[PDB]
Write an enzyme that holds these catalytic residues in place. Sequence first.
Site, PDB file in Angstrom:
ATOM      1  N   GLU A 197       0.408  -0.991   0.064  1.00 33.22           N
ATOM      2  CA  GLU A 197      -0.489   0.133   0.065  1.00 33.22           C
ATOM      3  C   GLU A 197       1.177   1.318   0.206  1.00 33.22           C
ATOM      4  O   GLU A 197       1.586   0.633   0.896  1.00 33.22           O
ATOM      5  CB  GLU A 197      -0.920  -0.276   1.632  1.00 33.22           C
ATOM      6  CG  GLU A 197      -1.983   1.297   1.975  1.00 33.22           C
ATOM      7  CD  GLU A 197      -2.840   0.831   2.462  1.00 33.22           C
ATOM      8  OE1 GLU A 197      -2.950  -0.329   2.820  1.00 33.22           O
ATOM      9  OE2 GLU A 197      -3.543   1.630   2.803  1.00 33.22           O
TER      10      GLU A 197
ATOM     11  N   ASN B  83      -6.943   1.736   2.911  1.00 36.57           N
ATOM     12  CA  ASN B  83      -6.974   2.419   2.702  1.00 36.57           C
ATOM     13  C   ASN B  83      -7.151   3.858   1.875  1.00 36.57           C
ATOM     14  O   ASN B  83      -7.582   5.148   0.925  1.00 36.57           O
ATOM     15  CB  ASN B  83      -7.193   2.948   4.376  1.00 36.57           C
ATOM     16  CG  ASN B  83      -7.992   2.307   5.529  1.00 36.57           C
ATOM     17  OD1 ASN B  83      -8.373   1.025   5.335  1.00 36.57           O
ATOM     18  ND2 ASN B  83      -7.435   1.953   6.600  1.00 36.57           N
TER      19      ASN B  83
ATOM     20  N   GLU C  49     -12.313  -2.931   1.713  1.00 34.70           N
ATOM     21  CA  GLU C  49     -12.769  -2.378   3.525  1.00 34.70           C
ATOM     22  C   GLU C  49     -14.784  -0.961   3.430  1.00 34.70           C
ATOM     23  O   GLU C  49     -14.158  -0.649   4.146  1.00 34.70           O
ATOM     24  CB  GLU C  49     -12.116  -2.161   4.113  1.00 34.70           C
ATOM     25  CG  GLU C  49     -11.094  -3.079   4.053  1.00 34.70           C
ATOM     26  CD  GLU C  49     -10.245  -3.219   5.550  1.00 34.70           C
ATOM     27  OE1 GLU C  49      -9.736  -2.351   6.534  1.00 34.70           O
ATOM     28  OE2 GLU C  49      -9.644  -4.344   6.552  1.00 34.70           O
TER      29      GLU C  49
ATOM     30  N   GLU D 116      -6.262  -9.493   2.926  1.00 35.64           N
ATOM     31  CA  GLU D 116      -4.709  -9.295   4.002  1.00 35.64           C
ATOM     32  C   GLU D 116      -5.024  -9.960   4.631  1.00 35.64           C
ATOM     33  O   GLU D 116      -6.103 -10.596   5.564  1.00 35.64           O
ATOM     34  CB  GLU D 116      -5.535  -8.219   4.135  1.00 35.64           C
ATOM     35  CG  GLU D 116      -6.102  -6.992   2.888  1.00 35.64           C
ATOM     36  CD  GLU D 116      -6.017  -5.315   3.491  1.00 35.64           C
ATOM     37  OE1 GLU D 116      -5.845  -4.846   4.718  1.00 35.64           O
ATOM     38  OE2 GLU D 116      -6.351  -4.455   2.758  1.00 35.64           O
TER      39      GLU D 116
HETATM   40  O1  AHR Z   1      -2.809  -3.042   5.747  1.00 30.24           O
HETATM   41  C1  AHR Z   1      -3.339  -1.809   6.439  1.00 30.24           C
HETATM   42  C2  AHR Z   1      -4.993  -1.130   6.718  1.00 30.24           C
HETATM   43  O2  AHR Z   1      -5.809  -2.353   6.664  1.00 30.24           O
HETATM   44  C3  AHR Z   1      -6.894  -2.402   6.869  1.00 30.24           C
HETATM   45  O3  AHR Z   1      -7.490  -1.989   7.504  1.00 30.24           O
HETATM   46  C4  AHR Z   1      -7.230  -1.960   5.525  1.00 30.24           C
HETATM   47  O4  AHR Z   1      -7.062  -2.478   4.086  1.00 30.24           O
HETATM   48  C5  AHR Z   1      -5.456  -1.537   5.481  1.00 30.24           C
HETATM   49  O5  AHR Z   1      -4.741   0.067   4.420  1.00 30.24           O
HETATM   50  O1  AHR Z   2      -8.502  -3.308   9.271  1.00 34.37           O
HETATM   51  C1  AHR Z   2      -7.997  -4.264  10.545  1.00 34.37           C
HETATM   52  C2  AHR Z   2      -9.189  -5.012  11.174  1.00 34.37           C
HETATM   53  O2  AHR Z   2     -10.325  -5.650  12.570  1.00 34.37           O
HETATM   54  C3  AHR Z   2     -11.652  -5.463  11.007  1.00 34.37           C
HETATM   55  O3  AHR Z   2     -12.972  -4.853  12.255  1.00 34.37           O
HETATM   56  C4  AHR Z   2     -11.844  -4.625  10.313  1.00 34.37           C
HETATM   57  O4  AHR Z   2     -12.521  -5.394   9.606  1.00 34.37           O
HETATM   58  C5  AHR Z   2     -10.515  -5.870   9.698  1.00 34.37           C
HETATM   59  O5  AHR Z   2     -10.774  -5.252   8.840  1.00 34.37           O
END
Ligand code: AHR
Ligand code: AHR
Lengths: 481, 482, 112
Positions: free
Chosen positions: B25, B70, B171, B280
């Site tokens: 990212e 994000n 997300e 992820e």
């Molecule tokens: O990888 C860190 C973050 O975790 C997830 O919440 C997001 O998709 C990413 O930007």
């Molecule tokens: O960013 C990591 C987060 O913890 C969880 O609630 C989110 O959905 C997951 O993406």
Amino acid sequence: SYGIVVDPKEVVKPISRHIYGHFTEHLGRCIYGGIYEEGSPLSDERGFRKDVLEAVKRIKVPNLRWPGGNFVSNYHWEDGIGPKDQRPVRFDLAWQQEETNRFGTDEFIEYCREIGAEPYISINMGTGTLDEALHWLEYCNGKGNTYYAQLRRKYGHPEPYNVKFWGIGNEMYGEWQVGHMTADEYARAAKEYTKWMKVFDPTIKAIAVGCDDPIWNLRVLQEAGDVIDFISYHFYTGSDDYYETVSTVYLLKERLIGVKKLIDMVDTARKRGVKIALDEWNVWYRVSDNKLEEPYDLKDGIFACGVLVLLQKMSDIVPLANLAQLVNALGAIHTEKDGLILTPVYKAFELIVNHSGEKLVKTHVESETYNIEGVMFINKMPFSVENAPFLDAAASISEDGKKLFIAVVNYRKEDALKVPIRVEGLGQKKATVYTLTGPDVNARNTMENPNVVDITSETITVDTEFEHTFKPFSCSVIEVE
Amino acid sequence: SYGIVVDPKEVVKPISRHIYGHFTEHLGRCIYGGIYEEGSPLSDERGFRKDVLEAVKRIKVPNLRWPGGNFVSNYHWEDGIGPKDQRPVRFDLAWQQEETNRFGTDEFIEYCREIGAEPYISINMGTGTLDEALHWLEYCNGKGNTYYAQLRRKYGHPEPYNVKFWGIGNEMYGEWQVGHMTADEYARAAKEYTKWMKVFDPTIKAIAVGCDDPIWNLRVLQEAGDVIDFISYHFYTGSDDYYETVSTVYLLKERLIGVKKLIDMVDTARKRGVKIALDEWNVWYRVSDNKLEEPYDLKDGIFACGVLVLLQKMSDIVPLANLAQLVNALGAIHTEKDGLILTPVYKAFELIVNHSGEKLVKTHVESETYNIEGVMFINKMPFSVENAPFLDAAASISEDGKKLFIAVVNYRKEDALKVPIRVEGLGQKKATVYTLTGPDVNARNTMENPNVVDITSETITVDTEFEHTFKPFSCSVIEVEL
Amino acid sequence: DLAWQQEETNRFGTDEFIEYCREIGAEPYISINMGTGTLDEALHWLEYCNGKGNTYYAQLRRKYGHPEPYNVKFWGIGNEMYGEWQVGHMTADEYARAAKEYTKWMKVFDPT
Ligand SMILES: OC[C@@H]1O[C@@H](O)[C@H](O)[C@H]1O
Ligand SMILES: OC[C@@H]1O[C@@H](O)[C@H](O)[C@H]1O
Ligand SMILES: OC[C@@H]1O[C@@H](O)[C@H](O)[C@H]1O
Ligand SMILES: OC[C@@H]1O[C@@H](O)[C@H](O)[C@H]1O
Ligand SMILES: OC[C@@H]1O[C@@H](O)[C@H](O)[C@H]1O
Ligand SMILES: OC[C@@H]1O[C@@H](O)[C@H](O)[C@H]1O
Ligand SMILES: OC[C@@H]1O[C@@H](O)[C@H](O)[C@H]1O
Ligand SMILES: OC[C@@H]1O[C@@H](O)[C@H](O)[C@H]1O
Ligand SMILES: OC[C@@H]1O[C@@H](O)[C@H](O)[C@H]1O
Ligand SMILES: OC[C@@H]1O[C@@H](O)[C@H](O)[C@H]1O
Ligand SMILES: OC[C@@H]1O[C@@H](O)[C@H](O)[C@H]1O
Ligand SMILES: OC[C@@H]1O[C@@H](O)[C@H](O)[C@H]1O
Ligand SMILES: OC[C@@H]1O[C@@H](O)[C@H](O)[C@H]1O
């Protein structure tokens, strides 16, 4: 490629005794002409068919579900109590029969006591009310001075019946159900009925309605998962093809695992340990009318053996199951005015229930597997199953630890299977093998020939390692020591 | 009590090669100062850190996800194409940093080509539009005379990039996401974007957003299950406690089975073979800032080995996974201006991807088990796991049928296990065991000491039956000629 | 202009407004466009006015003659968005969600 390994000293988990439940609805000749028939020469003076009684007693029913099914969604239980000649005749919307209410709550409870079964009563959420359900609960379970507790005494039963299992509605999602509801309506209603019934008697177990609509299931769990004890699942199957029928044991397996995963995905439900009640299941595909007198053959009985074996392995997730239904309607037992037939579905229970322990022991099974696409149920819906085993087993032991039971289903249609079996630390002993099978996959019992499909026994000699040849399309229990 | 029986002649199923994928990212120093550092003595003429490049090639990345995360939900891909000097500086809302856009689509594709990875691009559904996503796809994959295909040629790349994997949003359920949507909103939008993008290029795979909300997942499967190819799942975990961390391999396993059963419950999705993209995943629980330089230790690398072994056995349901993330941000590799550190999470990949086959073979494991109640992730959410094994394994074989790999994870925190292993029909011969190990559960590699946690190799002799002593908190691959 | 049905030459724009504010000694208070405008467009206005870094719109304010940020303190998140007379008018639920969205991201860029 085939083999079975058992360790009797390694207890995996209890097997819930309620997996072997049954169900009797006011449908066709299930109740009237089935378990009950005033003035049949074959009935006692309560109207209970004595030949049916003897057959039901033989399968040691742990619990019996009543009165529906579609029927209960337009049933008012008070029409079924008091002096019989004063009970109103009602038109049953579900199956389109006059209902005389001569079999009502007190007779059902008397039937349960007779056979040794825990009553499992389903409530009316279609035309019924909350008060009406609480009154039924008060009548059955109340030990105080409330009107309905008094009324039970007045009608000849001072001691509370203590009904433990209460079904919160039946199939409330289906357009066929009287007063059917949306997911949101039913979920709020299931929470409301359950929580207030539990305020009156906190000891009951409440079964809420589930189905194959995963949004339905989740609303029910989200809304009522803090108070309910089970979510129910109904499973009906079968087709003219042998493998298409018996393989759906393994479709049922995946369906159950799915519902279980839904529970896991709702914190309050997962945390309270809400479980599944498979409270209707059978083969059902030939008949579609208001009597449902499905003519089960051996194929169907092998499916039933496969389910019972499956439930022995999954009863921690599904502790309550009820074959639909006991007599005549999708009937395990078929009656005529002058006798009865024990179908291969009945025989499945007669086998497993008389040869099975209370605890599941480590069983490891090696089997060839097959993939299949077929149709199921009255509407011939396509399905597929992947990696269904030709051979399956579950080993259990008795409470005291003195007997081992190895149930084995050989699903192969075409060939017998010689199977090496290992049992850890087993002496070298005599054991009895009880085997359910028949001359062919469409074999049936009739009045003329009541034992074409029956359980045969042979003594065999058993050791830590031994082989046994299992006939095609059969289920056997090896009962040891 | 503990044992492993493998039958190399019973092939259970293929192992998807995309389970070993990675993710970069535009987050903290993941890109700038990480894979890409213009003018560094450590960088090549493209600005690619050469030391990083060598480390990334060693793990044979099969596909690489970019640019978020994000980030992408406020990223306008046209900002990052053309002459670098004319790319506009943007304020990235996600991680609150100025983004110069000097690393954009063309640099990313070049990076992928260099390391031999398939690109996997996520689209912006937060501030982006259907047109904008179509234009990105046309730029990358167009072979015609359309404006954006011509633009790709003009900027120096006549051949289309053929990007196969497309992330339909990131997300989009989370309130932290720019332009976050309700389930019905996202489910309708996923359908709309996926279907028109496949009108332009029917060969792409679309990954739609899933999460832990089953109603969200079901709206997405119901509305878009006729066009999407995967639903994604993100999984972050960890605590200070050793067992609380490694046991969540088995929490993940049940989460995945969950989402798979949701797919099963939606006929159009089930019939189309919609799968899961675990796009992820990592340990993440110590750091909570805009840089996320989580200092991975051996405990964390053992969790990762456990996930890869799990994915070898479940890749038919989860054929695509991407560790978050490759460099610095939740980084498998950590860089500084004068070098880099390979974390034990990186080492997990170094071990497994270099010593694994293409087909999974019959593997039966006997293991004692344990139950645990723990906390996970930066918010220390309670979780529980039932019957996690102390020992797990997956055996695989190469494409030609001539190498066997027996990956074994010993999760025991304190004791070695001497495990009897049976391989059906194996001659007596020599084999090599590659072992990821270190001195304690909290061991870390550093600039000063880059090899505290590393992979050892030793010859052993094997036969149809043999034994091997597996270090506690370790993962090993026994590599055998057949 | 749809609101008052006039040709608008735009010869009075942001830079002239700020200069007017500085002349009279008033704090600028800028209302944003939630009718036909977007989040990005609001953020770009804010960045043009208030950015002190190297973002495109901060640089753009410098390019047009004003190296120092304007530091606009008051931002109106929409005008009369409930009214049927408003271009792009919204229901309560739409405006409520949008106000949260515009406000939170504007404040991520400038929390003051
Ligand atoms: O990888 C860190 C973050 O975790 C997830 O919440 C997001 O998709 C990413 O930007
Ligand atoms: O960013 C990591 C987060 O913890 C969880 O609630 C989110 O959905 C997951 O993406
Ligand atoms: O068992 C027959 C019918 O099957 C189900 O559809 C109903 O609940 C029951 O009335
Ligand atoms: O009546 C049996 C029915 O087949 C399924 O569709 C119904 O939900 C199930 O209960
Ligand atoms: O098609 C309806 C069938 O009725 C139900 O019991 C079966 O499960 C369902 O698939
Ligand atoms: O372990 C196999 C199945 O997956 C689990 O979630 C179910 O509980 C179990 O029966
Ligand atoms: O296997 C048959 C069953 O065992 C016996 O006790 C039952 O009566 C008999 O029918
Ligand atoms: O015939 C089967 C009956 O069930 C068994 O348990 C009884 O002993 C046996 O006679
Ligand atoms: O179906 C999964 C595929 O099987 C293997 O042959 C391929 O390399 C892998 O990606
Ligand atoms: O707070 C919960 C954690 O963030 C997510 O990745 C974990 O799975 C989730 O349970
Ligand atoms: O990974 C195998 C899983 O086990 C079963 O419980 C699920 O249906 C299947 O996906
Ligand atoms: O086991 C480690 C890996 O195998 C070799 O190819 C890799 O380069 C080496 O690091
Ligand atoms: O160093 C371990 C590398 O992995 C193996 O495949 C290479 O030959 C070996 O040298």
